């Protein structure tokens, strides 16, 4: 419409109904000019870290993280009362757009409105561009609604061939100006809608049974087993006798079972105490990248973090592995710290019921055939892939964690649940790209065929609103005794948690999982 | 609509009809940026003065005071002609909104219009936020229609636990961006309507009878009483005789009565003459807070001011108590004065008919059982709560006084009439919040996930209009002789009262109650 | 329920202390009374209470 | 809290007697009636609509 | 009980001679008499409590 | 404050141990407990106050 | 039973009634070794908060 | 229920189940009980051995 009419309103809510919750988030954004209106190819040849790609002039909106859409109170209502969650529909608006001229004259900068400038926006619905939004990276909305955020710069990668960055004929370039975009002046606004595909509910419960205890404790099995090959308590001694017995109540380690625990790949275990670790450098041939479990893709090492879902240490335990996601509090300065008290540790220990431990093993296998002259021998199974009859539990979603990931486009995949948590989606929520339209500066009055390198310095601000419809399963359980609940236990504090501080800073001092309520196997 | 079209008009009126008066007030406001767009938690640990809470970036409109809605002539028409008053409906408009850029270059500031900036507005109709508007505080509209006022900054408190400010798990934080707001550019306007719940009329009359004189002076009672236990005029002397008599006309202190005066809690009495007071310091262990009647809430002292409704001294009397509200004239400088001539004293003395005096007592009680060997003894009743059969009169409303208060949300309450005067309301007129939308400054051209700390300096101005429908009860009394009226008695003046002065200042030099007309019990 | 104590008198003259009808010691003083604008009023009957 | 229901950022327009004397001590100093506006930060002195 | 007792402080009690109404009280009105008044006019006032 | 101070009379305060309800009070009821009673019968009486 | 759901706009998390009991030889709120059912805590109803 | 480590002690995640907390039919000698069920679609078991 006009320059003096607002093209949208501020909406932040959570609306709760039966089997349904709708969240709406509104933020203020600022968009700079990226790469001085240029596409730049980027890439470094650095062993395993070798990459190549392009940084675009464009930018994109990332809401992918849960604390974007929920207050800490709403996250509490969700995880205390409900067994399951999943997204249903989505709507995004971009409005109240303001383009700013910035001028420097005497050495000090002034800002004015440019009323005739445009900003370009398009959503990629058909996924024709590389999808970077699921990578677990910064640029998501700030969790606190009053904070203003910079729109992140868009860029992508391409095939790395070996450890060298040089491109081959299979590398692709993508110009985003080669897409239809809407162009918006201050009166214009943008809107797009999306439908989530049907996906299994996330499990917001922990199991109240163990996979190996699923039996009736009062009863014997009708199955029989070999109890011993000899009399007495000692190995390689006594009389050789095959002793069979009915499998009685009270020895439940010997019970025949229908199901097996899930897959495992062992992780290296580290201590939060510096004195209990061996001394492993960050770089060199002995670098810690070497001694963590890694995968090799085309000759390059990649840390297997988090990896397949596995039980891990408690968040307050001394030991930890790469199977645990780590978040930071405010206290660190400069992206490095020597103290674990400044970090937020994630624990999967809830799934220790159905899942093998991350740092222990799947089990121990008998690797020979014993006989009268051959003693039995066992080896550890450190990594055991999936076998018929296994059941397992996924990693938990976190309030600081990602909501979804895009299932890679491949003909094979197995159990397409993202390993950092959340909802695997063949077609995920689309990326919405935004750039400032270049405004040339004062040109030469004689013609040149050279491209224009000279531009007015500009940036834009505006409002973005995301609405997500969530489907929730309420807990119907018949458990008699009270559940674990997520509560505020923090006690007496100089400054409230989950609130702004003395100086106006909003920090998240805890990591909150979704698993409080329980369910039986 | 547009930038060149006004979105509202100036309306200031009082419209008088039968049983009805409608007031309309229009003011010009200015809204700054508060806390540099931040939420700040605030709190000091100071014994009884310990508090905690948050100051918001937002602001809110307060019309709660009577001189906002009435001219001194309209207040006169009301209180001379009418026995009763109460609000009925309300409508608020906010319009003609102007956002200003302010720039500093050479050391001197310039102001320009920013046509694309917005201001955010919402009314909290469902009372989900702490209601601060009834607290008897500054930020109400100026009584004089030509004056421009700053919009007050919004903030709230929370539970104080003991005398320490530290928060517990019961303290709540409130983000106002977590509410749906309308966003307004210069062409946009805002409107909201409200209905008052049914409330008893305020009594604009004083009683022309005394609670203890309600009898017929010409007649005896048929009741009998014990006149004396002895002959003669002296205590503990004479012959012991039980003497009974009919209760005759002319002794009206002995008459049996159906009703009792209201409740009392004694106040300390102070003199406006410095030499007639004992010397009581402002601070220390002997501080005046100690020797005023106070209440203890969770260990903290609070002055009981005004307290329950009680008769008090005349506004021109030497003595005064905390039961009297005090207003200031212009003369004081620096929020302190040693002279009472600069203040406006409020008097409740009209209610001395039905109410016990604030500084005297409810009465005197017989605290023993006398007998031949035991002399009778009496004690003062300083504080007597309500007993069946009491009747009382509320504190009066003042032209400088608050119109309403929000009845606290609690399961018990008794006679929910605000103690500073006015209309107790379960659902009061809503708070209407307003803030300037942050406009980021020139950002960095490389991405950072840090929040934006850099902002264009802005403020907004505009117009606000409040319309209240009032219901009034006209006086029908059969009194033969003339009433007391509120009049201009001021005599010959160098400068008119209730008018601007030589230099253009508008001051209120008197405090005007509502009680002039009389009514019989 | 609520209470405000009353002075108790005997119908037997010898069991009462000697209280005159008038004066500064007058019986109006030693009965429970209320003060309204400085005046004493006997609190008779007063709030409902069990009695003899 | 019932006694904190106010806005912590704002003063009342009400005035009160702060002290009857100069100095920090009882029964000492010069006898002076000192009045002041009731400022933000002393919330024990605020006039209130409700009682516990 | 008007104090707080402790190992060094003996407990002390005072009489409640006049106690106003508190939440949870129940009471009975005075009786009507054959020689007594039938009605009274409730005073015209904005407050009153249990207008019997 | 149980007296009236003056130049020759120091101020004096007493404790209010029992204070009945006065106009303008607000209060909160006792909480219900999982081991606690659900209801009570309001006594049959002509007066009662806040029958919780 | 009729229940009112909490609609509050509080940003930060509430206090909740939870099982905090930790590691136990015998579960609380469950029968014991010998078949006895005991209640080892007293549970009020007040966890959630509301502003005045 | 969940075994935590090699120790039997329960944690807060252990659940108790009272079966009297379910609706039951009660039967005297003349009464009888009946219930029906539908299997979900499942692959046939293979009752053959492979000849290749």
Residue numbers in the entry:
A (entry chain B), B (entry chain A): 222 to 742
C (entry chain G): 483 to 534
D (entry chain I): 431 to 482
E (entry chain G), F (entry chain I): 587 to 638
G (entry chain I): 691 to 742
H (entry chain J): 379 to 430
Question: What text comes from the article?
Answer:
Adeno-associated viruses (AAV) are single-stranded DNA packaging viruses of the Parvoviridae and belong to the genus Dependoparvovirus. They are assembled from 60 viral proteins (VPs): VP1 (≈82 kDa), VP2 (≈73 kDa), and VP3 (≈61 kDa) in an approximate 1:1:10 ratio. In this study, the structures of the AAV7, AAV11, AAV12, and AAV13 capsids were determined by cryo-EM in an effort to complete the panel of available structures for the defined AAV serotypes.
For AAV11 and AAV12, the closest related AAV serotype is AAV4 based on VP1 or VP3 amino acid sequence ranging from 78 to 81% aa sequence identity. In contrast, major structural variabilities (vs. AAV2) were seen in VR-I, VR-III, VR-IV, VR-V, VR-VI, VR-VII, and VR-IX for AAV11 and AAV12. Most notably is the 5 aa insertion in VR-V for both AAV11 and AAV12, relative to AAV2, but also to AAV7 and AAV13. In addition, both AAV serotypes possess a single aa insertion in VR-IV and display a different conformation to the other AAV serotypes with the apex of the loop positioned over part of VR-V. This subloop of VR-V and the alternative conformation of VR-IV are responsible for the broader appearance of the 3-fold protrusions of the AAV11 and AAV12 capsids. For AAV12, HSPG and sialic acids were excluded as a receptor, and no binding to the available glycans on an array was shown. An interesting difference between AAV4, AAV11, and AAV12 for AAV vector production is the requirement for the assembly activating protein (AAP) for capsid assembly. While the VP structures of empty and full capsids were largely identical, some alternative side-chain orientations, e.g., histidine 230 (AAV7 numbering), were observed. In the AAV serotype structures determined in this study, the histidine side chain preferred the “left” orientation in full capsids. In contrast, both orientations are equally adopted in empty capsids, except for AAV12, where the right orientation appears to be favored.
